[PDB]
Design a protein around this nucleic acid. Sequence first.
DNA 1: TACAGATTTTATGTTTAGATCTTTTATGCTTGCTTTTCAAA
DNA 2: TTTGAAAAGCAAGCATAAAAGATCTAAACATAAAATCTGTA
Lengths: 554, 52, 486
Amino acid sequence: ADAQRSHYTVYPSLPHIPFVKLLSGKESEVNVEKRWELYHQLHSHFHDQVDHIIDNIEADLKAEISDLLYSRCFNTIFLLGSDSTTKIELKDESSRYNVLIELTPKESPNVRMMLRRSMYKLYSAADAENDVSYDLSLVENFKRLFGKDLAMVFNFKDVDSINFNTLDNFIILLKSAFKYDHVKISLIFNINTNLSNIEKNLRQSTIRLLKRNYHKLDVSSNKGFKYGNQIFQSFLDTVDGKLNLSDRFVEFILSKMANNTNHNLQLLTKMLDYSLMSYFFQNAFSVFIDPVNVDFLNDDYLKILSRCPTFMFFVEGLIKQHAPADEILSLLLEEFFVEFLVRENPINGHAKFVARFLEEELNITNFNLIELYHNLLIGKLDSYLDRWSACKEYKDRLHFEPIDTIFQELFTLDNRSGLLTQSIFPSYKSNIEDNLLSWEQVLPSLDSGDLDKIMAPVLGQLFKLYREANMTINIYDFYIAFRETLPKEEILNFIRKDPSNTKLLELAETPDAFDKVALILFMQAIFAFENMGLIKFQSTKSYDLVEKCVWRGI
Amino acid sequence: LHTLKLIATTMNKNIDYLSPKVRWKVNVPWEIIKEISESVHFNISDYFSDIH
Amino acid sequence: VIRKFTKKNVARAKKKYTPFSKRFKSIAAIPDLTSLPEFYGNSRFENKLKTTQKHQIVETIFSKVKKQLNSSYLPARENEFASIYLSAYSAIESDSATTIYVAGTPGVGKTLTVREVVKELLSSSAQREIPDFLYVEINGLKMVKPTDCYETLWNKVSGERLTWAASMESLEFYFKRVPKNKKKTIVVLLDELDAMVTKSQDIMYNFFNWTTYENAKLIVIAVANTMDLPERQLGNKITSRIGFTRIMFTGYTHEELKNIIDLRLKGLNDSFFYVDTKTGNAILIDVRKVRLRMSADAIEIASRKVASVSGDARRALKVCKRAAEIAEKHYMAKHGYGYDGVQTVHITHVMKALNETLNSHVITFMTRLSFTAKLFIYALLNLMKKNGSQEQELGDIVDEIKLLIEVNGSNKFVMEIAKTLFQQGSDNISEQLRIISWDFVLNQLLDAGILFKQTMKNDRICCVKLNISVEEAKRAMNEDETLRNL
DNA sequence: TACAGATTTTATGTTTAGATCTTTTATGCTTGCTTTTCAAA
DNA sequence: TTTGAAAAGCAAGCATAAAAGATCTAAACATAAAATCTGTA
Ligand SMILES: Nc1ncnc2c1ncn2[C@@H]1O[C@H](COP(=O)(O)OP(=O)(O)OP(=O)(O)O)[C@@H](O)[C@H]1O
Ligand SMILES: [Mg+2]
């Protein structure tokens, strides 16, 4: 059986886009394909800029490491917030081999393996452009074998993960190469936590050795917000003139971006991407971000767009300002819808204007463009600009009031349904607890109908008694409590419904029938709880008591 | 926090994260957690002043 | 190509990989292996160890007794000889395959009587009473690897040199598919079978399984030191399936050992010798005629002591040789003889030769140690008398030594020796935490095997135990005139 | 057949991933006494 | 406003889980000489 196997490949039997028909299925397939292709050009336009930004991050970061790496001691570079993914380049410097050595904690169980891997990589790199011993006498004999001087650049990856005694002994080992006049050694430390956590794990003589020339480099993407602002601006120029961004959405972006520090840019890209997929999958008005689809107006579009609250406010203001009733009933529209979807919405260009004015005209760099865009959305840009004590004279030039335009609710990115929360950052164990406790929000209540009506599913019934119990539960008392909730008569009628099964009918007329059925269902639900991680047997060979492990609402 | 070893476990290799037998402990000194608590303006010393 | 490590001293034998199942096209294509000059065996290193002597050896009257009591030179093993001989003879004359398992303690004459059975079988085959056979001797304690037996036996069968797995498949195909009229009978002595079965039971099961084949013509004699070796290496189902002959070899009694010794000495006791009086050379018959004897009670008590302890012939022969050597040492020292009326080997010589085996040197070694080493052992004995733990921390021994020095200040010896123990008799040396030669005597008692020390880098909490017993230590420290009164 | 070259076989060394058992220490249960807040008069 | 009394606290003793590691095995990774198999010649 394949179900009892470790793994197996199924060559399915083959007996065209995932977008569905909206407007209760009355949308045309032409509009579905146009939504598909529209989403693809928006996604391509965003992601080309994102790829260019990521490539520029790589190029500038290699440039900074190459500048710091060049121009009788170690040359020490500390890369703070590195995550150790960058490929470090060394130049071509004549009459000198520049050899770069990567070491991970998995490649470093002891000092011997560090030296053997380092000298194997050194000998292989020197031969690439008679066997030898992979030890430090390769370093002292390097000019005798290859004729040129040696420059070793050690790159320790994930320094917060390597055993620090091994790393200390390896640095003390590499100190022995200082007596050779043809060797210089550079060390690169990929620090993730901070420098004070590193020097409390190293010995003081090693710190005194490393203090002769060291350079700190904040290599995080959070420093200065220079790369997050380019990604957010690329998303803004993708959706400029087509889609709006809500203050709820930008506040959600900021709140989720604060909770992750080492991986911020691709979380932002994932959130913006999923919002774009959700909008282009749920909204039939997406075809109207292109002006060539204005002849595709039908009835269902009009009754969907007539429920906009901006339209509601506009027509009640119209009955406030216009006394006669004949002009009001004429609007209650197709021609009025077209003339307002071609508005410029200059908040994106003005956000770019204040961004370049803050960066290149006031020499202020420590601003978040996402936070600035949120403050421009809520109308408090002055309360964001009154911090640096230099925008006081420019307070009146950068003024902007928000314009709540008509029919912007059909073209916006929001989160008022919690879909972005349920899909990207769910309350996983809370959802499991709430599905176990309630269960009528999962299984439908259709109106064995009687036993389905008056008896709960077994896992939810067990969880209702689990939650109200103490930390330590007696299993037999738990089974006694579970048996009281069950119907003693309707269950015995339920197992007699099928006359074809004869052994169950034989077991049904036993005087100990209902307790056996209750114990079987109880034991199956108890092992389901044990596999989920809800309970734990606090023993090995008795299995008489269990301990509660999970509490709802934590 | 576990992969940075600011938190540690009772076992170090082939770690069963989902087992209830595996327990957790802090792996920072008092000075590090003190400056972390002052970074977030949390009164961590108030939970230790009355105990000793 | 840049290598990750090198193996520069690989010496590989020129052994082929193709087994005997592919030497011929079919089972009917195999010729008569008896009529082949490489099959069934159809030593050039002696002249390396050759030289010429210049001076004649002086062969003393006791050197005949010494040379004639060597293990290199079958009373009491007649039922065992009869059993092995009739099993092997009945299986050879019926062209069958059998296996005889022989067990026993070392030195009871197992290999000797199996070899004597084999030579008697060879002599009977020389008289054409039974068909001819090959004799192969495989010793499990004479190998680098246990699988080399597969390499050896096939090399004695076919004459070719294969690797061990190919040799195993070759031997399987030989004993299974080769017909009986095209092959010869093989008698294998599997000596030291516990040496070849330690890693796994493949060699045991293969050699016993080959005797179950109807085409095998194989006699396997397997000699071991325990009886339950087939019962614990193979299961009872397998050992019931083969059905080997089971023979035990009990140790010799004292009368049997006595007959062994004077059968080694049958032509020498109460015999005459022409002895050169100026050199000591003796010739069996300026020259004196000397009779030579060993008394009966000396051999009697030697064979009585050996049969109580081990019962093997090697120990009895060796204590007789050692007694003769002691007698010849005193004889050569008395007469001033060189290397190039009645002479007897007495009861006292056998007594002394037995006493070298019987006595232990532990007490004698401990009574001749220095004061610091005896101080260490005395402090250790005091600590196991006080707390009764049998393992004492080294810091407790240090404090007990310090307390024993500080308490006995009125003693003349301790007052005279304390400046030596804590300052090496010098006023420029500060008072030391350890005594002088502390680690020296600790290492010496660890090297002698008197002590055991656990592996711990904290020198204070590290524990030390006596590795001998407490009574030899008590007897050693009560001998010393300094320690026994304090 | 001949023979250079490629592949297999046999043999062994290097490094890592994990299992089992032993020794010492943490941890939870039991039982009897002492302090302390909250439900009730 | 008391009050009293059951919940909470605490500690000595002890059986047991579990941490730390000593010791070891086996699989992945690696090399290498002799024999053996392939493709032309
Ligand atoms: N019955 C005997 N008669 C004479 N000499 C004997 C006898 N038994 C043993 N010896 C002597 O003692 C030696 C030891 O005998 P043998 O090698 O047969 O012992 P074993 O039982 O095979 O010992 P191990 O288990 O040590 O190999 C023989 O070589 C021989 O010199
Ligand atoms: Mg023997």
